[PDB]
Amino acid sequence: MLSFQYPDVYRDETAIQDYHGHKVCDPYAWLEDPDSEQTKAFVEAQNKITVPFLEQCPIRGLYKERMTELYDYPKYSCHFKKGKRYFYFYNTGLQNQRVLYVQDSLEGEARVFLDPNILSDDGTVALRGYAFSEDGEYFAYGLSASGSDWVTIKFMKVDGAKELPDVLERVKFSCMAWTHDGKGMFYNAYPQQDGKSDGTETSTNLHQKLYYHVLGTDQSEDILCAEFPDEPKWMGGAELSDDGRYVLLSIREGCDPVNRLWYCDLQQESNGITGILKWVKLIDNFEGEYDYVTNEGTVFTFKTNRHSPNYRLINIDFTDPEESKWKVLVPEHEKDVLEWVACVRSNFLVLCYLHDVKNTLQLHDLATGALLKIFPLEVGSVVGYSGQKKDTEIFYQFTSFLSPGIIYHCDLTKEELEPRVFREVTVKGIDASDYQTVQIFYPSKDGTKIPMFIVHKKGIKLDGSHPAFLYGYGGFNISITPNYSVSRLIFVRHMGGVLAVANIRGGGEYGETWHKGGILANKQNCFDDFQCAAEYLIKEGYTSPKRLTINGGSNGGLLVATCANQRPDLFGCVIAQVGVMDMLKFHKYTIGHAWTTDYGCSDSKQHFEWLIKYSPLHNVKLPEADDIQYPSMLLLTADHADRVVPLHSLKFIATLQYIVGRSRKQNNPLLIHVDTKAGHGAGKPTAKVIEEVSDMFAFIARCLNIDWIP
Ligand code: PRO
């Protein structure tokens, strides 16, 4: 099958660094420079072989055509009210970017409010964050170009959708919060740095500050409200309390679900927002999470994990702040994780729980925390919600593996709440009734039972002859819940595959204990859990090693790259998207410093010892057995992928091609594809999404020789 030659890549054999006594060679360290002629040549050379390999099989065109047909279904966001108008996002089907619409009433004629498609020919300019003024008459929105995390904030007057001249630059990982007087808005920005700031640079992001922009002024006049000169890594996001009296500052350092919480009573400012605010340091440590829900006077309701791994709701009275005085409003559940909470219709709380990786939604009384109503839902996830404290109705969107989903609506002014279907779309061509989703629990190496969802065609024989696609993330307290993917269903219907999603440790499926069970010294638990998922699928007859493909992106990219190194015998194909591969230097680039809470940092001897054992870049080794080679591998990244810089993938593929690719027994391809005008993934235009999934499934089809089923 292999009919190409890997490109020549210079090895700097002098690049040696000592890590606590352990010498480490990094011969491809020069790929860390994105703008060098050497790196640019490397990328061109790699793409030169990858593209023809992916496009040789007619299967790619068949998949692409099918994906284009099936993905063409109306896509709506929940309606949300702001001021006197309703807004919602809607994509007719194949538009590159969804459009924001506005209407005067739920039964009124809708009109376009903001169409990002006219901002670029290829749909590479996308909305990234937005905030309406309290009265709903002004609108702030962020725009990101080419997939970069960098944002430029723009403004509009809602009535007439008039563009305003206000423009804010250097915005990244920013809050957006208008003061209720409608005078200005809080946002975050970074200091000037040498080089570029378009997503192609690798420069670390430090010293983020909180500013206040007065509408109608130039950004140069913005007020600095908070900064942390002695703590370069801290990031403070502002939000206004529902009554607009307080500014709450949530300060974070890293990715752990914890934050300091300071507040500023705006009424106590000597003369408005003129400089650093009179911050009151309510919670001045990083011991727990405090997510504002609402407040009634000085009594603030927060969702927290303080002494509660599955989360709970507590009330802190600012006038009697000591912990011994806090009141528990809704106690922690023994197993179900409280994911999020919203306050609506003045005194109702909407609580969303995760029960065995499926969402449940319920209404509670704010005063007592008592359960009032359970909103019926099928097995799946809640992926959209609308309903503020001044609102008198809620909208929520549900999705699952087999259906795009439904948006429900509930008028909360009615004595007997009756949720009703507001919007429901069906995908013609895919009969959900022909497939099934099951949830099993498999034991890992240490005996821990791990959940896994498996989706397949009803009635298949578990003889191990089916191609399988196993997905995992495993980290950062992220829960991987059911979601609708037409791309994966085409693999099931047209390639005869089985889909599996493993809820390994490191995620937040079972609260903080689940997260802590897969980080730092225990990161290897993630990998063991994922490898055990693969073993289960094989033992149970869903697939065989040669027909199994594993996929993950970002921390999930690290996941699959590590599994390829540790158990190359268990997989036939590996697809890693925007993955972290150099665990020794990840903290040196862009926002990488934030991930040390999950991984540790090589600067520490103890941490280095954990990292070196699994860092993909440092564990590529020819399999000992003559009959075992590495699985076919495809790494995907992009020029503006500034969350997890491309250098990780570039150095990893160079190493794979040299160490493994040069061996006589290696016949499976080891390829990388670097896309242009794209980033980490958020905001990717539909056209690119279709191309990407088409590449992925074409790779799988070619490497495993899978026949298309019309
Ligand atoms: O999406 C991700 O996984 C990146 C890398 C780890 C933390 N955030």
β-pairing verdict for 22-25 and 299-304: unpaired
Structure's resolution in angstroms = 1.6
Tokens representing 586?
């990840």
Elucidation method: X-ray
Are residues 593 and 696 both part of a single domain? yes
Are residues 153 and 28 both part of a single domain? no
Are residues 336 and 381 both part of a single domain? yes
Write down the number of H helices and E strands in the chain.
Answer: 10, 39
Helix (H, G, I), strand (E, B) or coil at 658: helix
Distance CA 40, CA 34 (A): 7
* Any ligand 1 atom below 6 A from CB of 644: yes
Instruction: Provide the CATH number for the domain around residue 212.
Output: 2.130.10.120
Tokens representing 144?
């990101």
Q: Tell me how far apart the 2 most distant CA atoms of the chain are, in Å.
A: 77
Are residues 14 and 132 both part of a single domain? no
Contact 564, 631 (CB under 8 A): yes
Helix (H, G, I), strand (E, B) or coil at 358: strand
C-beta contacts of 591-595 below 8 A and 24+ residues apart: 591/149, 591/173, 591/204, 591/205, 591/643, 592/204, 592/644, 592/645, 593/204, 593/205, 593/206, 593/233, 594/233, 594/254, 594/255, 595/254, 595/255, 595/555
What are the start-end ranges of the E strands in 433-578?
435-443, 449-457, 468-471, 498-502, 548-553, 573-577
Contact 405, 493 (CB under 8 A): no
Residues 6+ apart with CB under 8 A from 118: none
Are residues 417 and 490 both part of a single domain? no
Distance CA 50, CA 151 (A): 32
β-pairing verdict for 468-471 and 498-502: parallel
Are residues 92 and 58 both part of a single domain? no
Q: From the alpha carbon of 643, which atom of ligand 1 is closest?
A: 4
> Rg (Cα) of the chain, in Å, rounded?
26
Using alpha carbons, select from 171, 246, 239 the residue that is nearest to residue 209. 171
Using alpha carbons, select from 46, 65, 123, 59 the residue that is nearest to residue 696. 59
Using alpha carbons, select from 552, 464, 465, 541 the residue that is nearest to residue 502. 552
Contact 634, 576 (CB under 8 A): yes
Q: From the alpha carbon of 594, which atom of ligand 1 is closest?
A: 7
Are residues 378 and 417 both part of a single domain? yes
Nearest CA to ligand 1 atom 1: 554
Tokens representing 22?
């352990």
Distance CA 101, CA 63 (A): 32
Are residues 47 and 79 both part of a single domain? no
Q: How many domains does the chain have?
A: 2
Which of 398, 426, 454 represents a domain boundary (last residue)? 426
| CA 443 to chain centroid | 27
- Cβ count near 459 (within 10 Å): 7
* Any ligand 1 atom below 6 A from CB of 645: no
C-beta contacts of 159-167 below 8 A and 24+ residues apart: 161/102, 161/113, 161/114, 164/138, 164/215, 166/213, 166/215, 166/216, 166/217, 166/219, 167/219
Tokens representing 325?
């005085």
Contact 374, 353 (CB under 8 A): no
Are residues 2 and 96 both part of a single domain? no
Contact 500, 533 (CB under 8 A): yes
Helix (H, G, I), strand (E, B) or coil at 498: strand
Helix (H, G, I), strand (E, B) or coil at 82: strand
Are residues 368 and 386 both part of a single domain? yes
Q: In angstroms, what is the span from residue 582 Cα to ligand 1's centroid?
A: 13
Q: In angstroms, what is the span from residue 680 Cα to ligand 1's centroid?
A: 9
Residues 6+ apart with CB under 8 A from 463: 541
For 384-445, the three-class secondary structure string (H helix, E strand, C coil) is EEECCCCCCEEEEEEECCCCCCEEEEEECCCCCCCCEEEEECCCCCCCHHHEEEEEEEEECC
Q: In angstroms, what is the span from residue 167 Cα to ligand 1's centroid?
A: 29
- Cβ count near 225 (within 10 Å): 21
Using alpha carbons, select from 691, 657, 682, 685 the residue that is nearest to residue 578. 682
Distances (CA, A) of 532 to 153, 214, 376, 549: 46, 55, 34, 14
Using alpha carbons, select from 521, 486, 594 the residue that is nearest to residue 232. 594
DSSP code at position 568: G
Instruction: Provide the CATH number for the domain around residue 528.
Output: 3.40.50.1820
Distance CA 453, CA 441 (A): 9
Burial of residue 203 (number of CB atoms within 10 Å: 0-12, 13-18, 19+): middle
Residues 6+ apart with CB under 8 A from 202: 32, 34, 588, 589, 590, 645, 647
- Cβ count near 396 (within 10 Å): 25
* Any ligand 1 atom below 6 A from CB of 577: no
Using alpha carbons, select from 128, 114, 225 the residue that is nearest to residue 179. 225
Contact 110, 101 (CB under 8 A): yes
Helix (H, G, I), strand (E, B) or coil at 686: helix
Q: In angstroms, what is the span from residue 616 Cα to ligand 1's centroid?
A: 16
Tokens representing 564?
């390829």
Burial of residue 160 (number of CB atoms within 10 Å: 0-12, 13-18, 19+): exposed
Contact 361, 372 (CB under 8 A): no
Distance CA 141, CA 161 (A): 13
Residue 12 is part of which domain span? Answer: 1-73+427-710
Distance CA 94, CA 101 (A): 17
Q: Residue written as tokens 């050497």?
A: 38
Let me know the angle formed at the C-alpha of 141 by 211 and 643, rounded to the nearest 5 degrees. 75
Q: Residue written as tokens 């340091």?
A: 281
Which of 378, 399, 426 represents a domain boundary (last residue)? 426
Q: In angstroms, what is the span from residue 477 Cα to ligand 1's centroid?
A: 11
Which of 391, 409, 426 represents a domain boundary (last residue)? 426
Q: In angstroms, what is the span from residue 590 Cα to ligand 1's centroid?
A: 12
Let me know the angle formed at the C-alpha of 340 by 144 and 211, rounded to the nearest 5 degrees. 40
Residues 6+ apart with CB under 8 A from 259: 250, 251, 252, 283, 286, 289, 290
Distance CA 653, CA 660 (A): 10
Distance CA 276, CA 185 (A): 15
Are residues 225 and 347 both part of a single domain? yes
* Any ligand 1 atom below 6 A from CB of 523: no
Are residues 503 and 394 both part of a single domain? no
Distance CA 505, CA 625 (A): 30
Using alpha carbons, select from 160, 80, 176 the residue that is nearest to residue 128. 176
